[PDB]
């Protein structure tokens, strides 16, 4: 699958590296997962289950 920094990302902090999951879906997160990115990306869209 495709992983990307969420908002909990970036510094070092327990579950580092990128642990979301990218949704190319035009409102990103789908049903049967939760968000993890209110922003970046400016095209598709990153969440978590």
């Known amino acids: 699958g ?6 909990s990302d970036g510094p070092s902090v327990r579950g580092n590296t ?10 990103g997160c789908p049903s049967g997962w ?9 095209i598709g869209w990153c969440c978590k289950q």
């Open 18 to 27: 990128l642990s979301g999951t990218l949704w190319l879906y035009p409102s």
């Open 34 to 42: 939760h968000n993890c990115k209110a922003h970046g990306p400016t």
């Open 2 to 7: 495709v992983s990307c920094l969420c908002d």
